Amino acid sequence: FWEWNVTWNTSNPDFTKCFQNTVLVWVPCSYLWVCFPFYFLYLSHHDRGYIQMTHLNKAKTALGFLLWIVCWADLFYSFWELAPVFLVSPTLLGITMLLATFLIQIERRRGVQSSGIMLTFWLIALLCALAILRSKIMTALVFRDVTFYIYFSLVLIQLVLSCFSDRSPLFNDPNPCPESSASFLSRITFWWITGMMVQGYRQPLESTDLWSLNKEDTSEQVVPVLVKNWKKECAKSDPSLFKVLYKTFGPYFLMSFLFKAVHDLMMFAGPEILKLLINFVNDKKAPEWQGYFYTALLFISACLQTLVLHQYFHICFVSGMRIKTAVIGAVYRKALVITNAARKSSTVGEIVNLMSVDAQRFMDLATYINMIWSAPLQVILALYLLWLNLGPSVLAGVAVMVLMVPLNAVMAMKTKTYQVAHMKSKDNRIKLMNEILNGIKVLKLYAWELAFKDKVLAIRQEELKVLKKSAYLAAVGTFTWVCTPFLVALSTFAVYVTVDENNILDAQKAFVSLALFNILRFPLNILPMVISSIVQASVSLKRLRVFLSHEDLDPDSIQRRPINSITVKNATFTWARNDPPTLHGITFSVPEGSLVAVVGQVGCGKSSLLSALLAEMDKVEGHVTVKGSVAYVPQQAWIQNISLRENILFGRQLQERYYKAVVEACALLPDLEILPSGDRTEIGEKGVNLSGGQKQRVSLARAVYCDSDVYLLDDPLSAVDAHVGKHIFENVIGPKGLLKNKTRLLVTHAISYLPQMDVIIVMSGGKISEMGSYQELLARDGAFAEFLRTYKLSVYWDYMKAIGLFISFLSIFLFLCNHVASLVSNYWLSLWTDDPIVNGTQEHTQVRLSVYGALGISQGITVFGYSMAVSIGGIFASRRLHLDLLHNVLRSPISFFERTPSGNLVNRFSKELDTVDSMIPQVIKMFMGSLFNVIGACIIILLATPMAAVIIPPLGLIYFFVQRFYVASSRQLKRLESVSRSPVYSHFNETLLGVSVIRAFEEQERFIRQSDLKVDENQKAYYPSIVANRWLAVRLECVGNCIVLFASLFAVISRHSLSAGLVGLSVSYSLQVTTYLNWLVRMSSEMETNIVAVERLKEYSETEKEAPWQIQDMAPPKDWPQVGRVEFRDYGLRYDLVLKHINVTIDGGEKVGIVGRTGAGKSSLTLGLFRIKESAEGEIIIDDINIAKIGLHDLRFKITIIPQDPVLFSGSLRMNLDPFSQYSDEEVWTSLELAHLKGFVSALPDKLNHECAEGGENLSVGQRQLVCLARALLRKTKILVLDEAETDDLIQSTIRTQFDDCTVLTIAHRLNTIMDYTRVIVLDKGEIQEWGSPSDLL
């Protein structure tokens, strides 16, 4: 059969009769025969119960019975009587049909709602039947034909039935995951998530809307299998973790291999069909059927490749997710089991980090593993195809691609070093900014704001130098990326043309190799990432192996007996296998309900005893028989971040009477009162911090509530005061407390409660010297006596304006020029490939190469240009935005700083500014590039085929809807996952810190179950994110495949009016457009969530600012305060009025103080002098000039203040005294000498340039106060204000020494100093209670 006359070269293409009856029937039957055996593996290993008896299942089974009969009815007619094929073809078909009906039967038995096999098999059978059908209907325009019609109709109905999903098996999961219930088609197309996609677009997702996890992804089903496998390997054996990993999750992972192979083959199938189409358009006088025949082949191959690839994505990521979950669980269990000796050597941060990155590396590696063979083979295969196409010249074409792999790497590593440089400078600035943010009070008072702004600008210049260098380096980074396509094309084509003149450049020889270069880009660029990830995963394997192999505790140490209470005979314990025994000879019997105080010389082994009783020490010998539950009060109190109530409860049923008897018996009532929410307050490191004594009380309260029979109290009363300790012992530990019948064993170094103890076990270097009772031990006069004797589109326009209109417009124009250069390069290639051959060589071949080179060189330069433009633009915008934000912040009044959430300014200056200067330019570059790559593909499709504008509207609508839904619903899922990630590591830190208490109470099961919930919660948000990426993927590749199909169809329909090169270029760009579309959506999502930073940086633009610092119309004279005559004329300060009815007059050079209680307007009065808060009603005038009219800086410079706590800023002492450096060195020296500081200031090796740290931590409080006094003295102003809280004698004498000439206001909380100052003003509630000298006061 297979004669090309009727199958290939004919107007009516009909498969031959033999071919119809043999191969078209062997294909489907054969598919089920090879899959059937393999399918039992899945059907057996994976079970979900059995589906009930439904009409659908039966309908399918009955049609399977009838179909088999019909096919065997053919054998009956063939038997009735010639051709051998008229017997076997139907018989085999009947047998495979009997396998099909048996398969739906067993699939019902094994719980299968929809079958992919029973769907692909029917699809293949349908296509084969369709081919025979068309042939049989063309043969007759009766005997065995009618049997085939019946067969085809039954097969079609069977295929339609196989699409519907059956009922769920009878054998809660509120809001579950539709993955386990969706039909084969929905799983293939990932439609089941579109629900959340639409819902997320309308109702912003929360933690409870997220679907539950399928049973296999729950940590409760993936940790026990890994634990069992690791136990089996450990018991069998240097145990290897990799063998465990690929034995536990490898079988599910191996299905990725098939998908990867099919995807590679289907990816390569594209260029071959492209070559066939280019041949077809060049081959005139050829049937249209061959051209349309292929346009279908391209479409089907592209769609199938898209579907298979994402299954692989899903499969790998599922395996990686499972890997992460199982590693997390095993690490948690190991950490709860391992020995203290093996645990101390490894750092706590080492272990939390082992779960923070090492565990996740493997989860990520899942997407860089298969490439280990996909990337080489692809490349190799591609190279071979390229070698088949052009020749050895293509080696030169790729010689530059392999040259870009190291170069690009060298680029990234360098900018990493700049990343290190920039970051460093940024740290310094934020540090400086932090000092301004917490010290804005002092700056405004001295008007030193501009001086600090200058230092901020200097640090910013330092940061922008590195930013400029990184900017220039980035420009070549994009240049090479965009130039690569042209570079490889020009290099290979110029070499091909120049090497030999007989080499003809045809459309197939130029565009097929051009597309092969595109499918070579990826496998050649991911290899370094794959290798780096594999090496990091290998070091993670080593780290996890050495951790999971750690030594462990053995329950044999203590023989706990369910409730002579504590029994130890000849027991020696160690803290390590090789270290000497901490306790050599331990032998004691503690009876039930007895109080035993282990007492001894610090460094004896008291805490070791309790640790041993808890099986924390390593028992080298002996016998310990602790009887009943043990409640441990550790020396170092472990506090859970949960509320104080749940700290005391410790996962136990709340009993109001017992809880309320425990809380005050520990004297926790005052602590409950001071704490904000009472016992519901969030204690711990993260929440409210607690004093050591409060932590010990909480630990003791938790132990007392747990109601154990044996208590091990390792110094519970170390941090509680003597009265609190005695009260606690009276109501808790004493014989008349809460634990009267409980076997208490306490470690103490305090004698006060010793006589009340039943037995006192004194030790010595880990050896009991005497074991008796207080009175008996005292009578014996031995070791115990010795012890006792011991003692929004507008934000984009705002960002463009920040860059500047000129730079943005120039960048857009140059980037359009790049676009046109690339397009005309492609058009020139198309025109070049169409030249005829005369005398065995192209008519023109040198001028075409020259124009190609010129076009490409123009492309490269403008790419390097516009990239540099946005780099300069980005840096310009960063400078302008920082300057504007700094001006707005510093110009704002204090009320803004007080009222704003203190902390949202810091991340604005650090995180959002970092977002602006670095991420925004890169994102705008790549988004703009992707957008115009898509537009170029569209225009080169529409230009080459004018009548293709009917497909743009629907596909654009599909793209717009998909992009809208994805961006909206994915930037929220990412936030949910990010939020959910942290609690796992926080809980691990808590467990690591409290493991001894966790094991002592034997509540490790509860905390194991808790770590289940948090990891499951994180997975519940991570899984929808990857499925969201898959949903994007399938929708966008469907759009791209439709583009390819329509481009090829509209090129084939107009073969006469088109040339080979034009069709080739159209198809190559249409093939490329899918990746550009995907990255365009991904980049648009990146830009939407990135540009908002500018919006939050444009804040405080209109925020009410202070009065102008310099008016310059009503500026005062140089000697503004000639005498300093202050007059508060009906002053009222809004804050309802803290200051009210203030009519006072302080004469020039008259000492005046302000006295008043808390809540008066004493301090607010100073804020009136410096205009910190605008006067609600008042006319303060100094001498003959109003303050409100004067600019702020002027008055703030002519009046000085010595505040409550002097703020010393980082830098030299001279910059502290004179930030402007306006005063000469002699003045600074004189002021420092007059401030009783000459002796100290001369002592520093740096002279005046002593580098004081943040807040002057190196300097003492007295020194900082004297430095502030030195600042005030150096100012030399007639009006000075003092704010009083050892060195008081010195500062008081100094303010009384030379400032007698100047007018001094004084607000002191101490009456002793104010008595010296005449004219005291007393403020009761803002009113002037008394106005006169202290002599008139008394």
Ligand X SMILES: Nc1ncnc2c1ncn2[C@@H]1O[C@@H]2CO[P@](=O)(S)O[C@@H]3[C@H](O)[C@@H](CO[P@](=O)(S)O[C@H]2[C@H]1O)O[C@H]3n1cnc2c(N)ncnc21
1084 binds ligand X, rule: CB under 6 A: no
1163 is in an annotated binding site: yes
521 binds ligand X, rule: CB under 6 A: yes
Nearer to ligand X, 83 or 531 (CB): 531
221 is in an annotated binding site: no
826 binds ligand X, rule: CB under 6 A: no
533 binds ligand X, rule: CB under 6 A: no
- What are the backbone angles phi and psi of residue 975, rounded to the nearest 5°? -65, -40
Nearer to ligand X, 130 or 935 (CB): 935
522 binds ligand X, rule: CB under 6 A: yes
| Residues ≥6 apart with Cβ < 8 Å to 233 | 239, 240, 243, 244
The CB density around residue 1104, as the number of other CB atoms within 10 Å, is: 11
Pick from 605, 929, 1121, 1153: which binds ligand X (CB under 6 A)? 929
1156 is in an annotated binding site: yes
The distance from CA 1293 to its chain's CA centroid, rounded to whole angstroms, is 58
- What are the backbone angles phi and psi of residue 845, rounded to the nearest 5°? -140, -15
Query: Is 1180 within 8 Å of 1188 (Cβ atoms)?
Result: yes
Give the DSSP H/E element, type plus range, for residue 584: strand 583-590
439 is in an annotated binding site: no
Query: Least CB distance from residue 1110 to ligand X, whole Å?
Result: 46
Nearer to ligand X, 477 or 856 (CB): 477
Nearer to ligand X, 313 or 799 (CB): 313
1121 binds ligand X, rule: CB under 6 A: no
Please give the Cα distance from 125 to 113 (Å, whole number): 21
Largest CA distance in the chain: 144
397 is in an annotated binding site: no
Query: Least CB distance from residue 383 to ligand X, whole Å?
Result: 16
Query: Least CB distance from residue 100 to ligand X, whole Å?
Result: 36
49 is in an annotated binding site: no
Nearer to ligand X, 1001 or 1079 (CB): 1079
Residues 886-925 that bind ligand X (CB under 6 A): 925
Query: Least CB distance from residue 863 to ligand X, whole Å?
Result: 9
515 is in an annotated binding site: no
Residues 446-505 that bind ligand X (CB under 6 A): 477-478, 481
517 binds ligand X, rule: CB under 6 A: no
926 binds ligand X, rule: CB under 6 A: yes
Q: Which residues of 423-457 are buried (b: 16+ CB within 10 A; e: fewer)?
A: eebbeebbebbbbbbebbbbbbbbbbbebbbebbb
From 280-288, 851-859, 943-951, 1074-1082, span contacting ligand X (CB under 6 A): 1074-1082
The CB density around residue 579, as the number of other CB atoms within 10 Å, is: 10
1098 is in an annotated binding site: no
Please give the Cα distance from 985 to 435 (Å, whole number): 31
136 binds ligand X, rule: CB under 6 A: no
Query: Least CB distance from residue 494 to ligand X, whole Å?
Result: 24
- What are the backbone angles phi and psi of residue 869, rounded to the nearest 5°? -55, -55
Please give the Cα distance from 1277 to 1124 (Å, whole number): 9
Query: Least CB distance from residue 1029 to ligand X, whole Å?
Result: 12
Query: Least CB distance from residue 516 to ligand X, whole Å?
Result: 12
Residue 762 three-state SS: strand
Nearer to ligand X, 414 or 521 (CB): 521
Query: Least CB distance from residue 317 to ligand X, whole Å?
Result: 16
988 binds ligand X, rule: CB under 6 A: no
Residues in contact with ligand X, total (CB under 6 A)? 15
933 binds ligand X, rule: CB under 6 A: yes
- CA-to-CA separations, 298 to 120, 411, 1165, in angstroms, rounded: 19, 38, 84
Pick from 1007, 1069, 1076, 1109: which binds ligand X (CB under 6 A)? 1076
Nearer to ligand X, 64 or 929 (CB): 929
- What are the backbone angles phi and psi of residue 542, rounded to the nearest 5°? -60, -45
Query: Least CB distance from residue 361 to ligand X, whole Å?
Result: 20
Question: Residue 908 has what DSSP assignment?
Answer: I
Query: Is 1272 within 8 Å of 1302 (Cβ atoms)?
Result: no
From 189-197, 719-727, 929-937, 1016-1024, span contacting ligand X (CB under 6 A): 929-937
268 binds ligand X, rule: CB under 6 A: no
- What are the backbone angles phi and psi of residue 1130, rounded to the nearest 5°? 55, 55
| Pairing of β 1181-1182 and β 1126-1134 | antiparallel
Nearer to ligand X, 647 or 933 (CB): 933
Pick from 186, 525, 910, 972: which binds ligand X (CB under 6 A)? 525
Helices (H) and strands (E) in the chain — how many of each? 51, 22
Nearer to ligand X, 632 or 1079 (CB): 1079
Residue 731: both structure tokens together: 């109501």
Query: Least CB distance from residue 477 to ligand X, whole Å?
Result: 5
270 binds ligand X, rule: CB under 6 A: no
Question: Residue 1252 has what DSSP assignment?
Answer: B
1079 binds ligand X, rule: CB under 6 A: yes
The distance from CA 716 to its chain's CA centroid, rounded to whole angstroms, is 41
1051 binds ligand X, rule: CB under 6 A: no
Query: Least CB distance from residue 962 to ligand X, whole Å?
Result: 17
Nearer to ligand X, 632 or 1076 (CB): 1076
The distance from CA 1191 to its chain's CA centroid, rounded to whole angstroms, is 48
1158 is in an annotated binding site: yes
In the block, tokens 């006067």 appear at 1175
Nearer to ligand X, 460 or 925 (CB): 925
Query: Least CB distance from residue 1076 to ligand X, whole Å?
Result: 5
Query: Is 1071 within 8 Å of 267 (Cβ atoms)?
Result: no
The CB density around residue 990, as the number of other CB atoms within 10 Å, is: 22
Please give the Cα distance from 978 to 966 (Å, whole number): 18
930 binds ligand X, rule: CB under 6 A: yes
Nearer to ligand X, 521 or 1309 (CB): 521
Nearer to ligand X, 331 or 1083 (CB): 1083
Amino acid at residue number 176: P
692 is in an annotated binding site: no
1211 binds ligand X, rule: CB under 6 A: no
Nearer to ligand X, 819 or 891 (CB): 819
- CA-to-CA separations, 1302 to 98, 413, 861, 1273, 1276, in angstroms, rounded: 113, 63, 70, 11, 9
602 is in an annotated binding site: yes
Query: Least CB distance from residue 267 to ligand X, whole Å?
Result: 8
Cβ-closest position to ligand X: 926
Query: Is 597 within 8 Å of 760 (Cβ atoms)?
Result: yes
Locate all alpha helices (DSSP H) within 636-742, ordered by sequence: 644-649, 656-665, 669-674, 692-705, 722-728
Residue 708 three-state SS: coil
Query: Least CB distance from residue 375 to ligand X, whole Å?
Result: 12
Query: Least CB distance from residue 1070 to ligand X, whole Å?
Result: 15
Nearer to ligand X, 520 or 1000 (CB): 520
1160 is in an annotated binding site: yes
Query: Is 429 within 8 Å of 459 (Cβ atoms)?
Result: yes
Q: Which residues of 1134-1173 are buried (b: 16+ CB within 10 A; e: fewer)?
A: eeebbbbebebebebebbbbbbbeeebbbbbbbbbbbbbb
Q: Could you list the residues known to form a binding site for ATP, using ranges.
A: 600-607, 1156-1163
Q: Annotated binding site, which residues? A: 600-607, 1156-1163
**Which residues of the shown chain bind ligand X in the complex (CB under 6 A)?**
477-478, 481, 521-522, 525, 925-926, 929-930, 933, 1075-1076, 1079, 1083
